Design a protein around this nucleic acid. Structure first.
Lengths: 10, 186, 189, 8, 10, 186, 189, 8
DNA sequence: GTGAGTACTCAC
DNA sequence: GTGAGTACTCAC
């Protein structure tokens, strides 16, 4: 899996 | 940076809720942010530019990571799996932004924004094609054809996620999908 | 008679570049060649106009799915014909595909999107039922749960429909279906 | 099967 | 004088 | 023809009253007509087009009569007097429309409408020049110069009429003005 | 010091093509190089900003009219110098001429137009007083009432100012003043 | 007389 | 025809 | 920052 998945909402 | 970011975060919050199924008007957006409509326009020239802010995040978030996969991971199947899983997991972690990716939220806004989304999908499809072409063992299928099938599966998953009010999770069936496919593309 | 002329007009507009934006009653009335008032003598709302088209979609797809189930008994051939049906129907009806994909419905009463969701559920259970009969008919199942496979197949179709719409109808849904089928068959046969 | 086109 | 002077308002 | 004319008559009525000193908004115009704002747009694409309706009346009203004077009256001084008196009397009989001629009412609207008024004044000045050139006895002054002076006097009279809230009547001093001038341009 | 920098900015904008439209506080603030808030620390309103320019107009014209009356005793020469003054001042101050002509003031408090009307009244009574002294100074009057002549002269000037503004400053107010003067003099001398 | 220009 | 809206603007 | 606006639009 790709670990670094950006999340826009805090 | 601050108020500009507050507005974008408010927009993404609305996209993520039931309101995301309808036009997000300046009146509703302002109320979500807790300011007047006029205050919005001190930080953005137009609502289209607020959406462009979200689109820029999607573009940069996804393409920087796809390029990193391409440059840092060596194996063909490995690279494809990671790019696919990145897209599906990004969508699942960002429901509101998926309504932008799927094009539904953009129906209410100037069509040039959907053009920008089309350009992003073409960039992703290009990465997929390049990954596949570097295997040359040969595939049982044209590289362009496979790339289109792969992205098509992702697009359908995103669409199902959005139309189900985020019930049908995009990553849920990916491992089974990939197990089936990978056994055949060798 | 005038009712179907209004539906024909709506479909023509959905099919053109107009379909990428709100289709107003003023614009629809003009395309038909009558006043807006005249429009509202045959339909009580825009939503009922869209429901007219959705009815054609539902009857077209479901009637043919039943025909396939009745005329063809081989499991994999059933699957191939149902997928082919959804893809070819969309290709033959670009404007109606904007309805299937949900994009044209963004401007309208939300109950219409619920209606399309219900159609996809009827289609997905159909694929599930087709897949489940394989065990008895052939003494064999699949390498994954039938529920997962049906979702993956309909998802593939939904992806083709979205791509068709995104590309302003350049990416034809049936393009390279044979290659897709050959690969899918190798995966599950 | 013959796929129907709604646009007559 | 020019007799025929148009008047817009009734 | 009917509702379209009612709207134009309502606009001219407002131009003629105190409201003419301020922006005539769609809200105020609709209320003057006794209809909703939306009804206005069934008869005109835009407020600019409503003003164009008034401008077309001014253009046609004035230029058809100036051409008639030119074609039907023979004497040079006679022709000039009639064209001057026509302009001043037209303004006096149509106070609201004079606010358009003077450019003041158009400040609130798209600048292309003032361009149209400039084109009308150039047409009038052209007529004046042509009338003067046909005398050739010679004038004690250049024909272009005299024409500009004559129209300048009219323009100033219109401006005084408008800025005085229609107290300073444009025709009031014309006979004295013309008596003085005509004694010298022979 | 900052007060006059705001007035200078407003006049620059009035002078450019910007002067043909509303001059907003956002635009003015930008031309100056400060925030709108900063603007409102020196003037309570836009109207007071315009009053600053009108003050310069009033003092410039009235002070020079008085000088002419005091330095020059010949009636016709007085008239020629006053007309020349109004025309040349406008030519030298195109942006302020939009204020004189009333066009730039359409966007602002109506009391500013009243103020310009009052200035024109002060100018017109000045011309009247100049004309009326001829009878005693020269034992001669005019072929028309002094009140009519003064109105006609100021009207001629107002026409030149309007033409200057209409033409985006192409039709200079002083153009061919000598020819105009020669003809006027022949009419009334 | 020297006509003043407001624009310095 | 019209209520309720629509994105965006203005002076303060 | 914001009240009150601004021309123009929509489905009914």
């Amino acid at each position: 899996d790709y670990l670094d998945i950006p999340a826009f909402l805090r | 940076i601050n108020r500009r970011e507050e507005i974008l975060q408010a927009l993404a919050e609305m996209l993520e809720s039931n309101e995301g199924a309808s036009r997000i008007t300046t009146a509703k957006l302002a109320k979500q942010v807790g300011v007047s409509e006029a205050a919005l326009y001190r930080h953005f020239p137009s609502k289209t530019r607020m959406f462009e802010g979200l689109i820029e995040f999607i573009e940069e978030s996804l393409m920087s990571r796809i390029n990193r996969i391409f440059d840092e991971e060596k194996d063909t199947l490995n690279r494809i799996r990671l790019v696919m899983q990145l897209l599906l997991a990004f969508a699942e972690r960002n429901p509101g932004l998926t309504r932008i990716l799927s094009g539904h939220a953009l129906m209410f806004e100037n069509e040039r924004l959907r053009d920008r989304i089309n350009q992003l999908f073409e960039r992703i499809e290009t990465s997929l094609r390049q990954i596949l072409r570097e295997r040359k063992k040969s595939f049982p299928v044209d590289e362009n054809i496979l790339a289109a099938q792969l992205l098509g599966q992702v697009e359908g998953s995103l669409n199902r996620f959005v139309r189900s009010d985020f019930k049908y999770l995009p990553t849920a069936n990916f491992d089974e999908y990939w197990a089936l496919l990978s056994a055949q593309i060798k």
